Write an enzyme that holds these catalytic residues in place. Structure first.
Site, mmCIF file in Angstrom:
data_model
loop_
_atom_site.group_PDB
_atom_site.id
_atom_site.type_symbol
_atom_site.label_atom_id
_atom_site.label_comp_id
_atom_site.label_asym_id
_atom_site.label_seq_id
_atom_site.Cartn_x
_atom_site.Cartn_y
_atom_site.Cartn_z
ATOM 1 N N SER B 34 9.320 -3.861 -6.324
ATOM 2 C CA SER B 34 9.659 -3.091 -5.110
ATOM 3 C C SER B 34 9.131 -3.887 -3.923
ATOM 4 C CB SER B 34 9.093 -1.716 -5.192
ATOM 5 O OG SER B 34 9.588 -0.927 -4.125
ATOM 6 N N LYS B 58 13.997 -4.765 -5.848
ATOM 7 C CA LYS B 58 14.421 -3.568 -5.113
ATOM 8 C C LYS B 58 14.049 -3.743 -3.649
ATOM 9 C CE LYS B 58 12.183 0.473 -5.202
ATOM 10 N NZ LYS B 58 12.112 0.695 -3.732
ATOM 11 N N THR B 59 15.029 -3.557 -2.778
ATOM 12 C CA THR B 59 14.856 -3.701 -1.323
ATOM 13 C C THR B 59 14.877 -2.353 -0.622
ATOM 14 O OG1 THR B 59 17.239 -4.079 -1.052
ATOM 15 C CG2 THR B 59 15.894 -6.017 -1.241
ATOM 16 N N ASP B 89 17.518 0.196 -2.377
ATOM 17 C CA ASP B 89 17.020 1.578 -2.586
ATOM 18 C C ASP B 89 17.325 2.411 -1.339
ATOM 19 O OD1 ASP B 89 15.668 3.812 -3.363
ATOM 20 O OD2 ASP B 89 13.668 2.864 -3.274
ATOM 21 N N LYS B 91 19.089 5.323 -1.326
ATOM 22 C CA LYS B 91 19.067 6.784 -1.568
ATOM 23 C C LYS B 91 20.178 7.454 -0.756
ATOM 24 C CE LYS B 91 14.258 7.231 -3.057
ATOM 25 N NZ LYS B 91 13.883 5.803 -3.072
ATOM 26 N N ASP B 94 24.503 11.780 1.440
ATOM 27 C CA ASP B 94 25.413 12.435 2.393
ATOM 28 C C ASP B 94 26.697 12.795 1.660
ATOM 29 O OD1 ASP B 94 26.501 13.294 4.962
ATOM 30 O OD2 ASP B 94 25.129 11.850 5.924
ATOM 31 N N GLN B 207 2.586 10.181 -3.170
ATOM 32 C CA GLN B 207 2.915 9.321 -4.325
ATOM 33 C C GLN B 207 1.874 9.558 -5.416
ATOM 34 O OE1 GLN B 207 4.991 8.095 -6.100
ATOM 35 N NE2 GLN B 207 5.324 5.890 -5.771
ATOM 36 N N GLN B 208 2.345 9.534 -6.654
ATOM 37 C CA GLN B 208 1.528 9.711 -7.868
ATOM 38 C C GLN B 208 1.830 8.554 -8.812
ATOM 39 O OE1 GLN B 208 3.322 13.752 -8.483
ATOM 40 N NE2 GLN B 208 1.130 14.254 -8.769
ATOM 41 N N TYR B 209 0.806 8.045 -9.508
ATOM 42 C CA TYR B 209 1.016 6.904 -10.423
ATOM 43 C C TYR B 209 0.804 7.289 -11.878
ATOM 44 C CZ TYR B 209 1.249 4.149 -6.196
ATOM 45 O OH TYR B 209 1.592 3.632 -4.979
ATOM 46 N N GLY B 227 5.670 -1.331 -6.479
ATOM 47 C CA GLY B 227 5.486 -1.807 -5.109
ATOM 48 C C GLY B 227 4.058 -2.240 -4.878
ATOM 49 N N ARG B 228 3.255 -1.366 -4.303
ATOM 50 C CA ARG B 228 1.888 -1.705 -3.853
ATOM 51 C C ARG B 228 0.996 -2.252 -4.974
ATOM 52 N NH1 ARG B 228 1.420 3.841 -0.570
ATOM 53 N NH2 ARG B 228 3.084 4.245 -2.075
HETATM 54 O O1 LIG Z 1 26.410 19.350 4.480
HETATM 55 C C1 LIG Z 1 26.654 18.441 5.342
HETATM 56 C C2 LIG Z 1 27.991 17.996 5.567
HETATM 57 N N1 LIG Z 1 28.249 17.052 6.456
HETATM 58 N N2 LIG Z 1 27.178 16.526 7.142
HETATM 59 C C3 LIG Z 1 27.493 15.528 8.157
HETATM 60 O O2 LIG Z 1 28.158 16.156 9.243
HETATM 61 C C4 LIG Z 1 29.391 15.475 9.559
HETATM 62 C C5 LIG Z 1 30.571 16.288 9.039
HETATM 63 O O3 LIG Z 1 31.729 15.598 9.489
HETATM 64 P P1 LIG Z 1 33.181 16.287 9.507
HETATM 65 O O4 LIG Z 1 33.135 17.411 10.521
HETATM 66 O O5 LIG Z 1 34.066 15.157 9.952
HETATM 67 O O6 LIG Z 1 33.516 16.751 8.109
HETATM 68 C C6 LIG Z 1 29.298 14.107 8.889
HETATM 69 O O7 LIG Z 1 28.675 13.148 9.741
HETATM 70 C C7 LIG Z 1 28.406 14.385 7.699
HETATM 71 O O8 LIG Z 1 27.678 13.216 7.320
HETATM 72 C C8 LIG Z 1 25.861 17.021 6.962
HETATM 73 O O9 LIG Z 1 24.971 16.554 7.678
HETATM 74 N N3 LIG Z 1 25.629 17.938 6.026
HETATM 75 O O1 LIG Z 2 10.271 8.774 -6.932
HETATM 76 C C1 LIG Z 2 10.294 7.665 -6.302
HETATM 77 C C2 LIG Z 2 9.091 7.103 -5.781
HETATM 78 N N1 LIG Z 2 9.110 5.955 -5.124
HETATM 79 N N2 LIG Z 2 10.331 5.341 -4.967
HETATM 80 C C3 LIG Z 2 10.319 4.051 -4.289
HETATM 81 O O2 LIG Z 2 9.698 3.086 -5.126
HETATM 82 C C4 LIG Z 2 8.648 2.390 -4.423
HETATM 83 C C5 LIG Z 2 7.292 2.907 -4.888
HETATM 84 O O3 LIG Z 2 6.333 2.094 -4.226
HETATM 85 P P1 LIG Z 2 4.799 2.024 -4.701
HETATM 86 O O4 LIG Z 2 4.781 1.386 -6.075
HETATM 87 O O5 LIG Z 2 4.181 1.138 -3.655
HETATM 88 O O6 LIG Z 2 4.218 3.418 -4.677
HETATM 89 C C6 LIG Z 2 8.887 2.658 -2.940
HETATM 90 O O7 LIG Z 2 9.764 1.690 -2.367
HETATM 91 C C7 LIG Z 2 9.562 4.011 -2.956
HETATM 92 O O8 LIG Z 2 10.425 4.167 -1.828
HETATM 93 C C8 LIG Z 2 11.512 5.872 -5.545
HETATM 94 O O9 LIG Z 2 12.551 5.216 -5.430
HETATM 95 N N3 LIG Z 2 11.467 7.052 -6.160
HETATM 96 O O1 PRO Z 3 -5.556 6.368 -6.165
HETATM 97 C C1 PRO Z 3 -5.795 5.398 -5.426
HETATM 98 O O2 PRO Z 3 -6.041 5.548 -4.210
HETATM 99 C C2 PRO Z 3 -5.786 3.996 -5.982
HETATM 100 C C3 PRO Z 3 -4.610 3.260 -5.389
HETATM 101 C C4 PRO Z 3 -3.495 3.550 -6.380
HETATM 102 C C5 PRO Z 3 -4.189 3.424 -7.734
HETATM 103 N N1 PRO Z 3 -5.570 3.916 -7.452
#
Ligand SMILES: O=c1cnn([C@@H]2O[C@H](COP(=O)(O)O)[C@@H](O)[C@H]2O)c(=O)[nH]1
Ligand SMILES: O=c1cnn([C@@H]2O[C@H](COP(=O)(O)O)[C@@H](O)[C@H]2O)c(=O)[nH]1
Ligand code: PRO
Ligand code: PRO
Ligand code: PRO
Ligand code: PRO
Lengths: 256, 256
Positions: B34, B58-59, B89, B91, B94, B207-209, B227-228
């Site tokens: 990560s 992962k970016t 990443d 996520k 929408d 965050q939990q490990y 990541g960290r």
């Molecule tokens: O549950 C929803 C549905 N849509 N949107 C956002 O609102 C707009 C809905 O566009 P529309 O009126 O063209 O369907 C889009 O930007 C969409 O990402 C939300 O934030 N939540």
């Molecule tokens: O449930 C999770 C938890 N973390 N992440 C992502 O994975 C990395 C976790 O980083 P860490 O090892 O430094 O805690 C971060 O980029 C975080 O956004 C997820 O995708 N899902």
């Molecule tokens: O819990 C803490 O703070 C340290 C850092 C992650 C692993 N242990």
């Protein structure tokens, strides 16, 4: 039930919510334009022409092909001139440590120009705690996603109740919800509802529409969020006025 | 249970999953770095030095202060050289019509350089259908977020089951899950687990490990995302090797 102008004075109101409610009352608008365009010039021309008709302009800056921070400076000039808030619909949805960097940093520097952002509650309250580390010092607000308008949404039942609790427990930063209806009984919280068009229907990727009268009047929401119902129309100013008048009258009729 | 190399040949395997499983077997690595850094030079220096130790990088490109598409070209050169996949990443979370533009367009053009992206399932299956309109033509894959490692996660119970169904019903594009444990019984799907460190604990934002032995060995996941535990260490190459050896041995012991 209190008017928007009276809600703007509630003891526990957030300053960003108060500013919004006062300009809603002043301008007789509870319309949020969803400015779902890929060109900066179109974003700015819509913001200028529709600014008087809207309480809020919702962005997706990660869909602008020609984003720069200068574009957002120009958007702020229009927001100040016409009196509307800027809401970046980023749907933060990561762990707290990650979302704080996504909000403050990178190319977009969202916190520097967005009055409002939103978050999904699925990660638990750390998503709010991470955002608020950046947003509280910058006097920003956040909306929690309690419901979605799309087919198969899992933001229902206990998930929606968890969003309301998280909002009501982070009320120094969280100013309301994205939802399809009133979900909080506390008048200090805003309800903003997407999935709105005058005509029945949807799109071919799960979007579903309800009317302004249904979502403001019957479902008790405050603000309609409208994208394609305005953006795809030939005359976007007249379309915005039709949505504004619909949402405003539905609000007045429920207030009685 | 089949080895990674045998899973790479399953009838219904996705081509991106097959490529990943073959390089995991070849390199004896089930570690995903990560790369949670804000500088392009640090991202690229980590990718080059740790490339031999990882199956995946992962970016979060929205946290790079100096993102350009040229940076991602240089990352692809390293990914090809060292044999690892690039996972943005993002996520996505929408409605389908919005995520297709967020995936293909804007400044980041994620689909042009990311082998893998991930999505939350909260919007319903339109989130997958929108992404797959871009990702299927570009031969990309997607991971669905079935669980999160953070305190208060709502990705539990029926929500997790909805993610598995959505994956298993979009198997032409969805190659697996972000999860804390095995959630699908179908060996064609990858399980990637974040919230991993050698030592117990967490962060101050939810965050939990858990350890590599716990999540690969006991909980049946395939890949650790770290990541960290690497990024904050002085010697990131030795840290990556410790995580690689931990995850790889846990996999071999469960395979028996
Ligand atoms: O549950 C929803 C549905 N849509 N949107 C956002 O609102 C707009 C809905 O566009 P529309 O009126 O063209 O369907 C889009 O930007 C969409 O990402 C939300 O934030 N939540
Ligand atoms: O449930 C999770 C938890 N973390 N992440 C992502 O994975 C990395 C976790 O980083 P860490 O090892 O430094 O805690 C971060 O980029 C975080 O956004 C997820 O995708 N899902
Ligand atoms: O819990 C803490 O703070 C340290 C850092 C992650 C692993 N242990
Ligand atoms: O005068 C106003 O506009 C506000 C509205 C409620 C009472 N004071
Ligand atoms: O359902 C449809 O396709 C049209 C467009 C949205 C409103 N009616
Ligand atoms: O030879 C190999 O590497 C693969 C692994 C399973 C069978 N064939």
């Amino acid at each position: 039930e209190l008017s928007f102008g009276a809600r703007a004075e509630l003891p526990r109101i957030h300053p960003v919510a108060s500013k919004l409610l006062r300009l809603m009352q002043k301008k007789e608008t509870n319309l949020c334009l969803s400015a779902d365009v890929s060109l900066a010039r179109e974003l700015l021309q819509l913001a200028d022409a529709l600014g008087p008709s809207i309480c809020m302009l919702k962005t997706h800056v990660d869909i602008l092909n020609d984003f720069t921070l200068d574009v957002m400076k120009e958007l702020i000039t229009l927001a100040k001139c016409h009196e509307f808030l800027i809401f970046e619909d980023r749907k933060f949805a990561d762990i707290g440590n990650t979302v704080k960097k996504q909000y403050e940093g990178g190319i977009f520097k969202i916190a520097s120009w967005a009055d409002l952002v939103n978050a999904h509650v699925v990660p638990g309250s750390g998503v709010v705690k991470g955002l608020q580390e950046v947003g509280l010092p910058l006097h920003r607000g956040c909306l929690l996603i309690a419901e979605m308008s799309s087919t198969g949404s899992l933001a229902t039942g206990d998930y929606t109740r968890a969003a309301v609790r998280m909002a009501e427990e982070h009320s120094e930063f969280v100013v309301g919800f994205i939802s399809g209806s009133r979900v909080s009984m506390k008048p200090e919280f805003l309800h903003l509802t997407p999935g709105v068009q005058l005509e029945a229907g949807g799109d071919n990727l799960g979007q579903q529409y309800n009317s302004p009268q249904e979502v403001i009047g019957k479902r008790g929401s405050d603000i309609i969020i409208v994208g394609r119902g305005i953006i795809s129309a030939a005359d976007r100013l007249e379309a915005a006025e039709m949505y504004r008048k619909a949402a405003w009258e539905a609000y007045l009729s429920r207030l009685g």
